[PDB]
Design a protein around this ligand. Sequence first.
Ligand SMILES: [Mg+2]
Ligand SMILES: [Mg+2]
Length: 445
Amino acid sequence: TPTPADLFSEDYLVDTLDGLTVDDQQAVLASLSFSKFLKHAKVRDWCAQAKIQPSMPALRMAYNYFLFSKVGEFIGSEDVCNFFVDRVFGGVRLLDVASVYAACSQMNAHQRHHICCLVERATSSQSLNPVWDALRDGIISSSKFHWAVKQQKIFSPAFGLRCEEVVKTLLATLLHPDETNCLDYGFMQSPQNGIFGVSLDFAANVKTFDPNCKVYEIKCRFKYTFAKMECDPIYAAYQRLYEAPGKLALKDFFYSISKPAVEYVGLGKLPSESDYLVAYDQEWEACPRKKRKLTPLHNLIRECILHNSTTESDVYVLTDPQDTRGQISIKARFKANLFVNVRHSYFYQVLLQSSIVEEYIGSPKYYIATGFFRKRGYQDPVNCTIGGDALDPHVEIPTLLIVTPVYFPRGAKHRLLHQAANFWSRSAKDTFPYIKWDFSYLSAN
DNA sequence: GGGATCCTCCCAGTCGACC
DNA sequence: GGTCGACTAGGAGGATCCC
Ligand SMILES: [Mg+2]
Ligand SMILES: [Mg+2]
């Protein structure tokens, strides 16, 4: 930030990021982003010409070359650049943007695919990776997708992570202990357009990308934290759920707070965006409440609901470690007619991820895994264990684990992808006018 | 990135003008 | 008293601060 790096210079990054911490480094790398790339003088001059009309994903691929040329040595992977020179550049170390772009525009789909894989593997460190901040810039990531679809930036000038790891430990140790899984995924760019990008949290049963595996998106709920106090309605509802695991006691639990994770959606009614779980069966209704109707202007919603109202969630009540001397395991497992809210952000995020996993394969099963946590109490064991693994004494305690399947109608998946891609284009044009963008091939890819 | 308090917008059931 | 129109109940979703 005080020492912004140049993507077009032989200066050594390492020379500038030895001292800094793992967090000031990312700030230094945050200046090697796509946005900063586009606004570079070398790139402006090149674009200023009357012939040059840059398209995607060619321009993203060019960017990848320069980025990994700059940070190759730092992250300890020179494979990306080695492939660019070996297979794309005819064996020449291209240094000018005009020539790098030309060579990039002559890549086939198999070659873009190969780069994006190499990039995913080189960033499988995730947050621990300082390039993460440079890479995710200018791209529609899973967390920007929903926003991008509603046209509601893209280019720019933790405790929660500890809880996700807990949910991950749960899935790896308790659900899929007898299978080979993958706990670490890097940043995954779209090889076909270079405007979308994601990373996966966890995958079970992967071959030694696997189209037959199970991909989990890991989330966390905290609104259902409770102190172990007699008077506490949440705690009380929890005790009933803990002793009598089932839909009825689950309902009471969910509704023990003002703003529940589950919403009852009646016939011809429009689901709100309040939370990520819906129920269509009236058995989940509590008190009659007005609800906007599903008008003919909601065929998207209706199509998505159509394909997400059959396969039920799996609810896992976890053993309280206070009663089990530390060990946290599955006390009870039951199914529930609760489904993913297709209008909630979580639906979109897993939608993008499923789309991108497709490109890296050319179907796997997709689930949202959500852990419900509570703050530790004075009598909670400090050193808890989950199967073999241990639990961080500083992280909250998981009480519930709900796994919910997600399905994506091809027709809805497409319109949403294309809507976001258009917002990206309009933003690209507005943010970088000096660039005579060529989106002809984009509107069709 | 989730949660809660506050604040805005507006659909929908309510109820007011009126004949 | 009944149709329609205007009124207001909460539904619904954004922005901020906190953590
Ligand atoms: Mg996640
Ligand atoms: Mg989460």
